[PDB]
């Protein structure tokens, strides 16, 4: 079908962990879904100590926002690199076919823009990331990655073919940072990106992250920004990691249905405690909450979670079920 004959719909993106509006089951035929993102190089404070890095972002956030389409829609992205930036950037979609996922067609210097179109032929959650030839891991590990969800036209299905419908969705982007250290162990800072580059390469080659965070900073998904749900609600958590493996776990819950490597033509794994999302992948977990209270959502290398930053919280409202769990005898000396 001639693409100029299809409907166009413009999406207005939101900041993670929230997700723009969409319908699980497609309410129209295939469409050209129009997105715009503006690259922003910016300083970000990433820990409680005040460590400040030069982040490279899509739309001002780490991770970049979640894009949502259906299978056999066309994604049309206007990518803007304002002249207030200093570096060359591009974009590679793991959802796309050809030209390095789009990276070979989207190289933009400061003061340039470009528009890419691709057909979303495979359903699943997928990573997108910047990847300029010769400086790929530097851009990705400076925060320049997000994800796209390509829903089946008839929505999600369980291992038997019956519908799975979520009530809420969140997007957790997990970021490994490599902040250069001196011989004594303290972070260095740098005056220009070029003066930083060799020590960024040195720091990356150790293979050891200094920080591993959700939504761009230690503690970002806690306090006033904890995730929320109610007892009985069905929640989909999309989780991406563009560079290193992670092992997500809902402390106090499970992944009732999990696509660990993110592709919806496969049946989900049931009843997971913890699952492996390989570096370079997006995964998705569906859970129905059964108990109120605080939960933590972590990478279950618990050092990475509780010392390096890879931990967030849910606050869940509703009634407690003593059949599922109860304290029979509360802690006491006797």
């Amino acid at each position: 079908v001639d693409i100029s004959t299809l409907p166009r719909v413009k999406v207005d993106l939101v900041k993670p962990p929230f997700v723009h509006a969409h319908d699980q089951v497609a309410k129209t035929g295939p469409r050209v879904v129009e997105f715009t993102m503006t690259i922003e190089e910016k300083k970000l404070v990433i820990d409680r100590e005040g460590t400040e890095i030069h982040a490279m972002t899509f739309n001002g956030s780490v991770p970049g926002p979640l894009m949502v389409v259906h299978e056999n829609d066309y994604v049309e992205l206007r990518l803007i690199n304002p002249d207030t930036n200093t570096l060359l950037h591009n974009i590679d979609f793991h959802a796309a076919t050809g030209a390095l996922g789009g990276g070979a067609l989207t190289q933009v210097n400061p003061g340039e823009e470009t528009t890419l179109r691709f057909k979303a032929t495979k359903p699943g959650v997928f990573v997108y990331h910047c990847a300029p030839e010769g400086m790929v891991p530097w851009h990705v590990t400076s925060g320049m990655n997000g994800a796209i969800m390509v829903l089946p036209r008839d929505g999600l299905k369980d291992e038997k073919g019956q519908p799975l419908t979520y009530d809420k969705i969140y997007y957790v982007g997990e970021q490994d940072f490599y902040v250069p250290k001196d011989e004594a162990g303290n972070y260095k800072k740098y005056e220009t990106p070029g003066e930083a580059y060799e020590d960024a390469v040195k720091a990356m080659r150790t293979l050891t992250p200094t920080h591993i965070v959700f939504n761009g900073a230690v503690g970002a998904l806690t306090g006033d920004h904890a995730l929320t749900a109610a007892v009985g609600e069905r929640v989909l958590v999309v989780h991406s990691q563009a560079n290193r493996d992670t092992r997500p776990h809902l402390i106090g819950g499970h992944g009732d249905y999990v696509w660990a490597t993110g592709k919806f033509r496969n049946p989900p794994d049931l009843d997971q405690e913890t699952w492996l999302i390989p570096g370079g992948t997006a995964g998705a977990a569906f859970y129905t909450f059964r108990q109120p209270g605080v939960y933590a959502y972590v990478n279950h290398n618990l050092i990475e979670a509780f010392e390096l930053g890879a931990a967030g919280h849910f606050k869940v409202t509703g009634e407690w079920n003593d059949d599922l769990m109860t304290s029979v005898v509360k802690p006491a000396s006797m």
Copy 2:
């Protein structure tokens, strides 16, 4: 059904790698299954060089013992922290739903005890571990973790729905330790847990284990303590890793049916050489032995196996099958 109307059964636990008595197919309706564990802080020698650490244990062992129930039983655990210990502890069951897996309800100071009940609503093998707020990875990586198996009421099934019945079961707990080192590379020792804490945190933040062991020490599952089997026996090996990925492999055999991420509502993977158990997970592998002799069972990062400790042995009795394997010409000069 009112829980006070159900049968109660008391379990008497055994030391790993052995497993307490149970029936694969449930011989009764749902029960309250009663367990007791006593926390023990103790010194342990973990390598051939004599390196001694302060371990934190459930029931005196690293790992803690394997607990076994059926789906929709209630687990009722009496957890005792004697006044000979010095620290606060608790317990989180990945099998349980609510209150951080039980951790929010089981905080016991030295000289206290508590009793927790939860309904085992999902079948599989699952990690349990201590997790005190603010010091979670320290307790877990001091050895304070084990596993629980929740069997389907009608026992295990293959990828086609037919029964799988084991003749023997073993539990291998794999432990990553982070023993602090001085600048020259030698381990330090410490006079109190508080004086140790900052350097334990420093050691953990390197993300690099000093030791990775089965059943609490280098060589623990060898010699007089090698695992055993006979040709033709069906063996289930439950394997847990509460903090880091592992990649188990039976040298000379296979995993004929493997639940790599441990949850029995999913069909097993067939004919595995090696499989990935993510950190924070228990997995299980079923094998029927076909050849006698010595086997090694390893994490197949072979550095981790043969230099850091992650290797045990089977000794298998019976007749050799020359159709499966034979030396046609023995090593010789010619």
Copy 3:
């Protein structure tokens, strides 16, 4: 059936990434398939800087060559250790059952040979590697590993039971090296294998590779040695890693059908972006190319790919499909 009554066929191996001739669907009954490999200790330059190591090889290459048989054939390997070598070697097949995969029966000193036979009872791709008692990870991480493919007698099948037939096959062996470094960070060199051994053990115990390469060196699968295909061709990429996890990704494509842990009795995962091959495993991915141009094939820890060596290329011939992807507005200032 008496093995002396079966047909014998002699295979002549080829250097990776190419694969010797075979038929996907078996054209005969079960056979004794005869292979010969000669061990070669040799110097190899592994990076652009000229770093030279002492490699330990099967047949002169890192990885060793891909062997191909069908399920229930017998593999008969003549393994030769010439007197120009200095070390003891052997071979363990993850495809085989008993005697440590063959390692206990194949110990050859320089100037010796041996012939091993085993029945290939399980279909899949599997690692083979040297494993001499007490020096296993040293030999494996010096390059002494390859893979064997055991095809189902009726060829490969998809998740629904229909045939999958490849037009081309390649074998990518991925090698983690641990070249010892002095305190300043420069590689050391050594006069004899014995004088090298303690520092090789020290380097391995850091768990941090210095190099991670495809086909034995940085850049080996690029330039005049890039992999090739045409639009519309079906390609199987077999990928092994004998010691560490990897996360393969075709940049610009997908794994349409992937056996991540390599065993063909299981249904493949569909539409993968990236997949996890555990250390100690071979995996296989099937893709039909849809677009011409250059692709990169990587470990998607992008530091490991683009700084440490784990990246190769495809050059694909044919016509571009603007429906799948197009530049709507080329990069420009406006």
